[PDB]
């Protein structure tokens, strides 16, 4: 139940990715723009569905308290395998089952915290168990569970 100041800051940083204009609410339009920047192409009906599921009052947008309520509860879910696969799909935008340095760099630039190109190479190398220069799904699961 207990949330730390650091956990709240982490959830705030996740919220700020979707609130493109920084005005305090996530709109359906912003959600679509961010999803497409992460290589996905949701339908307008899917976008409206996602807003409605998080929007606790009726006003049609997501504010941070609504976002935090959903994320703090998700922190107590046990389906870790499904969440890690969703993260894998964010990186693996071409769906070939392997994350390249270029795919990692692309996600990095969209999500905020900057990594140098040397750090991108290092992150790939340290997860690349079999040494083909890319991160497959089973390597990614081990990376994300450490």
């Amino acid at each position: 139940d207990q949330l730390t100041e650091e956990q709240i800051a982490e959830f705030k940083e996740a919220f700020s990715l979707f609130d493109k204009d920084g005005d305090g609410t996530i709109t359906t339009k912003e959600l679509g723009t961010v999803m497409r920047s992460l290589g996905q192409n949701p339908t307008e009906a899917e976008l409206q569905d996602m807003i409605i599921e998080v929007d606790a009052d009726g006003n049609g947008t997501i504010d941070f308290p609504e976002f935090l309520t959903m994320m703090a509860r998700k922190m107590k879910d046990t389906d870790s395998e499904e969440e890690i696969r969703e993260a894998f799909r964010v990186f693996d935008k071409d769906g070939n089952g392997y994350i390249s340095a270029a795919e990692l760099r692309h996600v990095m630039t969209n999500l905020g915290e900057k990594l140098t190109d040397e750090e991108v190479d290092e992150m790939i190398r340290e997860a690349d168990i079999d040494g083909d220069g890319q991160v497959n799904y089973e390597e990614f699961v081990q990376m994300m569970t450490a």
Binding site: E13, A87, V90, M108, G112, E113, M123
Partner: peptide
Amino acid sequence: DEVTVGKFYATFLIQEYFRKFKKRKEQG
């Protein structure tokens, strides 16, 4: 539910991975 919630939580998990990586690398 898990489909919608999962997209938002996935970006958190990725941001956390990057943040922990950078913090550990620069640990004094």
